[PDB]
Amino acid sequence: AHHHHHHMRAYLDLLQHILDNGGDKGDRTGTGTRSVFGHQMRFDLSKGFPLLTTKKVHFRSIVIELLWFLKGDTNVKYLQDNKVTIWDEWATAEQTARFGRPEHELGPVYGHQWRNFGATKNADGTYNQDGFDQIKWLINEIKTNPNSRRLIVSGWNPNEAGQVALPPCHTLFQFFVQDNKLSCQLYQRSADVFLGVPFNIASYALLTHMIAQVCGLGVGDFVWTGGDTHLYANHFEQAKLQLTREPLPLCQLKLNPEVKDIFDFKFEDIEIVGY
Template sequence: MATASIPSELVGPGHPEWQYLDLMRRIWEEGSERVDRTGIGTRSVFGATLRFDLADGAMPLITTKRVYWKTATREMLWFLTGETNIRPLVLQGVKIWNEWPHARYVNETGDEIVLDDFVQRIADDEDFAERWGDLGPVYGKQWVDWPTYRYRKDGTYEKGDGINQVARVAESLKTSPGSRRHIIEGWNVAELDQMALPPCHKTYQFHVAGGRLNCLLYQRSCDVALGLPFNLWSGALLQRMMAQQVGLEPGEFVWMGGDTHLYLNHEHLITEQLKREPQSDPRLEIVRVPDSIFGYRIEDFIVQGYTPHPPIKAPVAV
C-alpha cells in the first residue's frame, strides 16, 4: 500500500493541538501495521500521552477538522443517565452508536435492512427499540450502576445494590480530596461479553492539587482519526462538570492511550488533516450549576471561539 509522506515541518510546538497532529503523523509513518478485529487493518503505536491545561475555559477541541461537540456532549450526558439503549440518542439525532445494534440485528435475523431504515424504526417503535436498540451493560451502566454480589454461607451469591461510581467520586473529592482512589472504571470483566463493544475509554482518575482538579483518562484502544477528537472533548467535559460540582478550578487533562491506531482506509482523512494547521482557540462556558453532576442539559454548554476547518468524512470500523 502506497504511503503519503507527511512533511515533518508541519508538526511543531505552539498550539496544544499540535500534540494530536504529531501523534497522528507518528502513527501513520512509524506505526506497526497490524491485522485487527474489524479486518480493515491498522497502523498502531502502544502507549501515547497528550496533556491539555483547561484553565480559563480552554478545551481540547480539535480545529483541523470540525468536531461535532454537541453530539459528543449528548453522548456524555447519556452515559451519566446509566442508559444503554440507543433510542434516546437516536431521538436527538446522535448517530455514533447506530452501527453496532444494526449489525447485531442483521446477523441475528437475516433481515438486510439498511442502516437508515433500522434507525428510523428504532425511533418510531418503542418495542422494537427495546429489543434491538440495547447495547448491553456499556459505559453508563458501569459508571452509575456497577453490579455487586454478596457471598452467602451456603456458597451461593445474591445480587446486591449497584454502585454509582460517579456519585461516589464526586463525594470523595469533597470529603477526601487527597485520596488516590478517585476512579471511575468501565472495564467490568464479568460483563464484557454482554457489551456491544467493551469500553475503550475505560478508566478515569481524578487528582486534586492547588485548588485545581486534574483528570487522567486511560484508553485501552483508540481510533485516532475518528474517535480521539470525541474522546478528548468528552473526557475534558466530564472533568469540567466534576470540577464545577466539587468547587474546584479545572486543571490538567491527561489522555493516555494503549493501542493507539489509525485505520488503513482513513488515509485520505489523515493526509488532508495533516496539511492543515490549528486556527482557533475554543473555550467552553458552563452557564448553569445543576444540583448534581447528573443534572446537566445540552443548553448548559456554550463554546466560543471555535472556527474549525471543514469536516472530513471517513467510515467507522465496526
Template sequence: MASASPLRDSPPARHPEWQYLDLMRRIWSEGSERIDRTGIGTRSVFGATLRFDLTDRAMPLITTKRVYWKTATRELLWFLTGETNIRPLVLQGVHIWDDWPHARYVRETGDEITIELFIERIANDETFAANWGDLGPVYGKQWVDWPTYRYRPDGLYEPGEGINQVAQVVKSLRTNPGSRRHIIEGWNVAELDRMALPPCHKTYQYHVADGKLNGLLYQRSCDVALGLPFNLWSAALLQRMLAQQADLEPGELIWMGGDVHLYLNHAELIEEQLVREPQGVPRLEILRRPATIFDYSIEDFAVSDYAPLGALKAPVAV
C-alpha cells in the same frame, strides 16, 4: 565593561493541538501495520500521552477538522443517565452507536434492512427499540450502576444495589480531596461479553492539588482519526463538570492511550488533516450549576472561539 545582552521575547507557545497531529503523523509514518478485529487493518503504536491545560475555560476541541461537540456532549450526558439503549440518542439525532445494534439485527434475523430503515424503526417503535436497540451493559451502566451481588442463606446469590461510581467520586472530591481513589472504571471483566463494544476509554482518575482538579484518562484502544477528538472533548467536559460540582477549578487533562491506531481506509482523511494547521483556542462556558452532576442538559454549555476547518469524514469500523 560589556553591556548586558538585550532581553529577547519568549517564543510563542506551541498550539496544544500539534500534540494530536504529531501523534497522528507518527502512527501513519511509523506505526506497525496489523490486521485488527474489524478486518480492515490499522497502523498502530503502543503507548502515547497527550496533556492539555483546561484553565481559563480552554478545551481540547480539535480545530483542523470540525468536531461536533454537541453530539459528543449528548453522548456523555446519555452515559450519565446509565441508559444503554440507543433510542434516546436517536431521538436527539445522535447516531454514534447505530452500527452495532444494526449489525446484530442483520446477523441474528437475516433481514438485510438498511441502517436508515433500522434507525427509523428504533425511533418510531418502542417495542422494536427495546428488543434491538440495546447495547448491553456499556459505559453508562458501569459508571452509575456497577452491579453487585449478595449471597443468600441457601448459598445462592442475587443482584444487590448497583454502585454509582460517578456520585461516589463527586462525594470523595468534596470530602476527601487528597484521596488516591477518585476513579471511574468501565472495564467490568464479568460483563465484557455482554457489551456491544467493550470500553475503549476505560479508566478515569482525578487528582486535586492547589484547588485545581486534574484528570487522567487511560484508553486501552483508540481510533485517533475518528474517536480521539470526541474522547478528548468528553474527558475534558466531564472533568469540568466534576470540578464545578466539587467547587474546584479545572487543571490539566492527561490522556494516555494503549493501542493507538489509524485505520488503513482512513488514508484520505489522515493525509488531508496532516497538512492543516491548528487555529484559535476554543473555550467552554458552563452556563449554570445544576443540583447534581446528573442534571446537566445540552443547553448548559456554550462554546466560543471555535472556527474549525472543514469536516473530514470516514467510515466507522464495527
C-alpha cells in the same frame, strides 16, 4: 509555517508519530493499520478546550452522549429522541440479537458501568440497583477527601466486556486535585487516532469541567493515555492532510454556572465559545 495551538500540536504529533513510527499490521486482505502501544498526551484545560478536529456540529452529540452515560441509561431511545445517532448501529434488532437482547438495548455499556457497576440481574430481566454508583461516590470523595489517590471510575467488568458490541474503549479514568484544580487521566485500551481520539478527548475534558464546577474547583490537566493506538490504512492520506491543514482557532467551554449537581446538566447548559 503553520503555528498550531498546543492541544492540536499534541494531537498532530500523535498522528505524525503513528504514520512515521507505527508498526504495521494486516495481511494481504483487509485494511491494515500502523500502531504504537502506549502513548500519552497532556492538555492544560486553562489554555483552551481540546476540541481538536471535532466539528462544532458534532459537539452536540458528544454532549448528549455524555449526559446519557451520566444518567446510567443503556437504552438508545434517549439518544434517538435527541437526534443523536452515535449508537444506532449497535441498537438495531439484528445487532442486539447477537447478544440475545431486545432492540434498543445496548447491554452493559458505559451508563451501566458508571452508575451501577457489578449489579446483579433480576428475574424480570432488568438490573437490580445493587451495583456501585461510581459517579456518586466520586463526587462525594472529591468534595470530602480531594487528596484521595483513588478517584477512579472504571468502565471495565470482564464478565460483561464480552457481552457488548464494543468492549469499553474508554476503559478507566482517574481524577486528581492540586491547588484547587481538578485533573483527569483517561486510559483508553484501544484508540483509533483519526476517527475516535478527538471525540473521546472532548468528551472527557467536558466531563472534567462539569465535575470541577459542581465541586467548586478550577480545571487542571486532561491526560490522555492510549493502549493499542492505531491508524487504519484507509486514513493515512486523510491523516497527512490533517498534518498540513491551517491551524484551527482556540475555543473554550461555557457552562451554566447555576448547575450544582452532576446529574442536573442539560444540553443547553453546555456550549463552545471563542477563547
